[PDB]
Each structure stands twice: as C-alpha cells, then as structure tokens.
Design a protein around this ligand. Structure first.
Ligand SMILES: NC(=[NH2+])NCCC[C@H](NC(=O)[C@H](Cc1ccccc1)NC(=O)[C@H](N)Cc1ccccc1)[C@H](O)CCl
Ligand SMILES: *[C@@H]1O[C@H](CO)[C@@H](O)[C@H](O)[C@H]1O
Ligand SMILES: *[C@@H]1O[C@@H](C)[C@@H](O)[C@@H](O)[C@@H]1O
Ligand SMILES: C[As](C)(=O)[O-]
Ligand SMILES: C[As](C)(=O)[O-]
Ligand SMILES: [Ca+2]
Ligand SMILES: [Ca+2]
Ligand SMILES: [Ca+2]
Ligand SMILES: [Ca+2]
Ligand SMILES: [Ca+2]
Ligand SMILES: [Ca+2]
Ligand SMILES: [Ca+2]
Ligand SMILES: [Ca+2]
Lengths: 198, 141, 247
C-alpha cells in the first residue's frame, strides 16, 4: 500500500504540558493530528508534519476537566489511514512536576518549610497559573525530614505550601517535599524534590 | 569537591554537592547512612536538562526527572516552542480562517452563490433575500 | 426518525416530501429553486413516473395550512453505477417541472464544494437528520416532521461491527435510541458551520432502526458534487428516469 497506520500512541503530560507521541518515522508519507472532546468538533494540529510528535497543550488547557481524544492521520507523499489514541483527562492524568523547596527557616524548637509554587501551562489571565490554582483542595504536599543521626524518616503534610514541623534542638535536619493528589489512582504522587539541609 | 584541606571542615550538602560537584564518597560523608545516600544519588545523578537551552523564541525551561518542560510565549507552541501560529494559514487549519470556501496557492477565500466576500477577505454575507443554508424565521425581526 | 423531536414549522425549510399516487414515498432536499436531492432506492418500484409529486414547505401531513408548494417531478437522475437492490451510489437528482418560490418556509440547503466538505464539514461532529419516516423499527410513520441530531463516525471506527464504501459514511448512536429509519430515506443530513448549513449526507440504509451495535448509513454527498453540478447544466431528456454516467 501507499501508507501505514501509526501506532504506540502515548500521552506525555507534565504540569498540563501535553505532548502526543507515536510511531514510526515517516517514509513516503506525512502525518496530521486531530483532537476533540467527547462531543466537540475535531480540530487539526501539526498539519502534514514529518515529526512523530505533536504538542496539544494549547488545546487541552482550554478545559483541563474535559476528557480528550485524538488520532493520527497518514497521508502519502476514501478516508486516509489513522489510529486512535487512548482517552486523556488532563486534570486526572497529568504528571505532577518535581517540586522545589523555596526556603526554610527555624525559630527555636520549630522550623518552617516553604515550597515554591509550581507554574503550570494553563495560561489563564495572560499568565501561567500555579499548581494550586488548578487543583485547590485536591493538592497537598508531603514533607520528608530527618536527622543525620535518625534511623528512619519522619513525615508531614500540608494543605498549603508551608510545613510547620517540630525539631530536636541543636540537631541538623534535611528536607524533601513531594506533590500529592490523594484523589488519584494513577499519577498519585510526583517525584521527590532536591534535598535541602540546614 | 575536595580542595586543599577542604576535608578538614565538616561536610555540607550546599558547599560540596550543590555549590560544587560532589562524588558519591563525598555524599556518603554527609549522609553517613548508606541507604539514604543511595536514595540521594539517584535524584542527584539526574542532571539539569535545561543546561542545553532547548527552548526557543524566548521560552523558559524547567528541569524535570529525565526531561524538561518549555513555557512558550503566546504566539508559540511545541516541545521547544519552535512552532509559530501565523505560519500555518492554510485550508486544513480551521478552513484557513475563511467563513466558507478556501483555496491554497496567500490563501484566498470565496463564497457560495447567493453570498459575496466582504472587504476582510474571509467573511461572506447574503446578497439575495433567501440565501441557502439559513432559517428566515430565525434571522428576521 | 427514532427518538427524535418535532421540527418546529419553518426550521427545516429544505425538507422535501415526495409522493406517488398521493401516497408517501420518500424525503428529499431542496438545494435550489429547481433541483432536489434524494435517495435512489426510493425510485426502484415506481411505475407511474407521471404521478410523481414533490411537496415543499410541508410540516403536518394531516392538515393544509397553505404554505405547501407542490411540483411535478420532470426528471429523475441517478448514477449509472447505482444498482437497484443494492446500497452503493444511493443518490438521485430530481428536476422539478417548474421552479418553486422561496419563502420563509421554503429555503434551499447549500451544496458545498468538494474540498470544503472534505476538509471542514466532514469533521463537524453533529448534524441534523429529518423526515416523516417511521418513529420505531417496523412502526407507523410520523405526521409531523421529526428531526434528530447525530454524530458522524469515520469508516474505520464504524467497521468495528467492507460493507461501508467510500461513497458512504456512518452516523448515529450504537445505544439503540436515536436513529433515522424507514421512510426518512432521501432526507437531508445537514451540517452547520459559521451561520450556514450545508448538505453532507443523504438518508440511505441501515441494519434495523436504532439497533444496538450499529449506526445509520448515509450517502457521502461530497463524492457527487461535480457530478450533480454537471447535470444541473445539462439539457433535459424526454424520459423521466435517466441513468447518468458516474463520474
Ligand atoms: N438509518 C436507518 N436505520 N434506515 C434508513 C433506511 C432508509 C430507507 N432505506 C431502506 O429502507 C433500505 C432499503 C434497501 C434495500 C436493499 C438495498 C438497499 C436499500 N433498507 C434498510 O436500510 C434495512 N436496513 C434493510 C437492509 C439491511 C442491510 C442492507 C441493505 C438493506 C430509504 O427509504 C430508502
Ligand atoms: C539540551 O538540549 C537538547 C536539544 O537542544 C535536549 O534534547 C536536551 O534534553 C537538553 O538537555
Ligand atoms: C519565561 O517564560 C516565558 C513564557 C517568557 O515570558 C520568558 O521571557 C520568561 O523568561
Ligand atoms: C428553541 As427552537 C427549536 O424554537 O430554535
Ligand atoms: C450499519 As453497521 C455495518 O455499522 O451495523
Ligand atoms: Ca568543597
Ligand atoms: Ca569536598
Ligand atoms: Ca551556596
Ligand atoms: Ca565550592
Ligand atoms: Ca567531604
Ligand atoms: Ca572526603
Ligand atoms: Ca532533571
Ligand atoms: Ca401540510
């Protein structure tokens, strides 16, 4: 034949930065990607590209709550060959980016640990919204802290971006926060942040 | 890192692993416990993918686990913000902005019989009283 | 139409009612003052080609409000590729003996260009289907004009059931609730795009009305754009039926 259907259609999303990827590299053909909602019209992206990927960020940030479905067409170079991608709900499936400890501060027998708000790709109000502006009460951060002389690791959790933990006076501590959404069976937790010691 | 008599000082993650490039042996000196040292080396070995400046056209990068993400400007899109919105004006792309018929070559818009193309070169309007594909009892009074 | 709603009077101004000996035959679609598009299978059993009438501006069959406009069908034109008893190439082009007058209740549906219909309209999800056909599978016809909204499917997805050709496309629901039916054949499959409706399909055939695991099949009008426009500039032959070559 004059064309082959795409395959291995996988979703790569982090902080709503959604990239569709497929295979194989083009030989005597080009690709066109379509995307829509459950009942929305099909909009085309990456027209006749030789790339095996396509950025669909601008399309899914319009409503991250909606479930999106896409497909990759194959034109040679009545309907052309194509392949459907798995359904994708950004709000429920996007990967939580690696958090970063913005700062920490001690005042006696207690220490405050602040987390930097992770900017997403949702560009509402002409500026990127933070991770908490999207999930709200669904988003929490888990703190892993410990002494150099500790056996295991203590844990803390916050609904905001600040931990108010107690510490042993004189002892030196380390920290590592993690973004979490308990209302998720898949992509429940982010990766551990870089370590920060006192 | 280990400079002249540096190891006389007590080890610090900031000065050795963050401010310089520490080895696994320098990391072990700070964490002491091996199991916690290994857990640190996994995340620490993963470098900063933004060091190569993959983003383009004034995009901002953010390091990630074995990857990165580019915050593109409004008129740009793509993994590295390489795509421009304007350089895609063709009939496949939202009908080329044409209200009705489109043609590739600058793309030219056209209108079905009974309509006529306006000055904007994309919008059509009825020239007759009863144009096709419109409901009179909904476009009157 | 199964599981549809009554189309308000005047909101389907292109819907045509075709009659034979005064009996309800099939639906149709006004595309201009003279020409009407319909399905081919509706003309398989015709004998009295002279008693073929096309009504426009109709809504209620049991009443005559004065908005109706009747015309004799001067010439029925179908593709030579079409074969009675089969589903492929199910389309007919009718020439009304005299042009109808366009009113608030009589307005034609735009016949789109090929490229425009293939590139844009084909990807508008939902479209309208209407007619006075059966309200249920093996049921009674409708008195008031019924209308239904249905999503379009690409042939690859519809073949989850080579029965569907490139001159066809599927549309509807596989849940068995909303679908076109017998008696609606020939009716319009109209697609909206920026304040304008276009003809993209014709009620053709299906494996039972609103049957689970199946969709309604429609003639892909975009295939016959050049063919139709060609005949609308042709000299009429004396015979009513006319099997024109396709393409
Ligand atoms: N969308 C639906 N479910 N039904 C629409 C039917 C519209 C109606 N068409 C019909 O009623 C056609 C008639 C036909 C018979 C033989 C070959 C071709 C056509 N019959 C059908 O559509 C039946 N499904 C029977 C059938 C099944 C499978 C294949 C073909 C026909 C028009 O009046 C002619
Ligand atoms: C350095 O830049 C390349 C492409 O420019 C990218 O692939 C790497 O991920 C980045 O670190
Ligand atoms: C990082 O973000 C992008 C969107 C641009 O605003 C850059 O100028 C900035 O540094
Ligand atoms: C709400 As209506 C069917 O009168 O357009
Ligand atoms: C009309 As079918 C072949 O999708 O059941
Ligand atoms: Ca050092
Ligand atoms: Ca050192
Ligand atoms: Ca430093
Ligand atoms: Ca140093
Ligand atoms: Ca050291
Ligand atoms: Ca050392
Ligand atoms: Ca990294
Ligand atoms: Ca009537």
């Amino acid at each position: 034949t004059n064309t082959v259907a795409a395959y291995n259609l996988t979703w790569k999303s982090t902080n709503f930065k959604t990239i569709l990827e497929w295979e194989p590299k083009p030989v005597n053909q080009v690709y066109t990607v379509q995307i829509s909602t459950k009942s929305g019209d099909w909009k085309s992206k990456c027209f006749y590209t030789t790339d095996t990927e396509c950025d669909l960020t601008d399309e899914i940030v319009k409503d991250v709550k909606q479930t999106y479905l896409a497909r990759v067409f194959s034109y040679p170079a009545g309907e052309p060959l194509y392949e459907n991608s798995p359904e994708f709900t950004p709000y429920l499936e996007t990967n939580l980016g690696q958090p970063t400890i913005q700062s920490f501060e001690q005042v006696g027998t207690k220490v405050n640990v602040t987390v930097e708000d992770e900017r997403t790709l949702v560009r509402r109000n002409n500026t990127f919204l933070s991770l908490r502006d999207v999930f709200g009460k669904d988003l929490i951060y888990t703190l892993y802290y410990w002494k150099s002389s500790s056996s295991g690791k203590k844990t803390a959790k916050t609904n905001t971006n600040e931990f108010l933990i107690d510490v042993d006076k004189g002892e030196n501590y380390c920290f590592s926060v993690q973004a979490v959404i308990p209302s998720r069976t898949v992509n429940r937790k982010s990766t551990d942040s870089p370590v920060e010691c006192m | 890192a280990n400079a002249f008599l540096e190891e006389l000082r007590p080890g610090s993650l900031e000065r050795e692993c963050k401010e310089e490039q520490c080895s696994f042996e320098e990391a072990r000196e700070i964490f002491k416990d091996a199991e916690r040292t290994k857990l640190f080396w996994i995340s620490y070995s993963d470098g900063d993918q933004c060091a190569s400046s993959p983003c383009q056209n004034g995009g901002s990068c953010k390091d990630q686990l074995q990857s990165y993400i580019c915050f593109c400007l409004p008129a740009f899109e793509g993994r590295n913000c390489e795509t421009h919105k304007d350089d895609q004006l063709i009939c496949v792309n939202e009908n080329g902005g044409c209200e009705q018929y489109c043609s590739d070559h600058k793309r030219s818009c056209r209108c079905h019989e009974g309509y006529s193309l306006l000055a904007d070169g994309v919008s059509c309007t009825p020239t007759v009283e009863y144009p096709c594909g419109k409901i009179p009892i909904l476009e009157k009074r | 139409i199964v599981g549809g709603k009554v189309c308000p009077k005047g909101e389907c101004p292109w819907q045509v009612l075709l009659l034979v000996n005064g009996a309800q035959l099939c639906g149709g679609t006004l595309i201009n003052t003279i020409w009407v598009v319909s399905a081919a299978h509706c003309f398989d059993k015709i004998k009295n080609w002279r008693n073929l009438i096309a009504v426009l501006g109709e809504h209620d069959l049991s009443e005559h409000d004065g908005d109706e406009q009747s015309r004799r069908v001067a010439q029925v034109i179908i593709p030579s590729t079409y074969v009675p008893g089969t589903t492929n190439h199910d389309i007919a082009l009718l020439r009304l003996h005299q042009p109808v007058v366009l009113t608030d209740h009589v307005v034609p549906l735009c016949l789109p260009e090929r490229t425009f219909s293939e590139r844009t309209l084909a990807f508008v999800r939902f479209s309208l289907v209407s007619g006075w056909g059966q309200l249920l599978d093996r049921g009674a016809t409708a008195l008031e004009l019924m209308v239904l909204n249905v999503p379009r499917l690409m042939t690859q997805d519809c073949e989850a059931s080579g029965k569907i050709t490139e001159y066809m496309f599927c549309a509807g629901y596989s849940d068995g609730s909303k679908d076109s039916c017998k008696g609606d054949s020939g009716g319009p499959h109209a697609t909206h795009y920026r304040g304008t409706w276009y003809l993209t399909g014709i009620v053709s055939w299906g494996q039972g009305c609103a049957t689970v695991g199946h969709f309604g099949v429609y003639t892909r009008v975009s295939q016959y754009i050049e063919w139709l426009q060609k005949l609308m500039r042709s000299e009429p032959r004396p015979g009513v039926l006319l099997r024109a070559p396709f393409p």
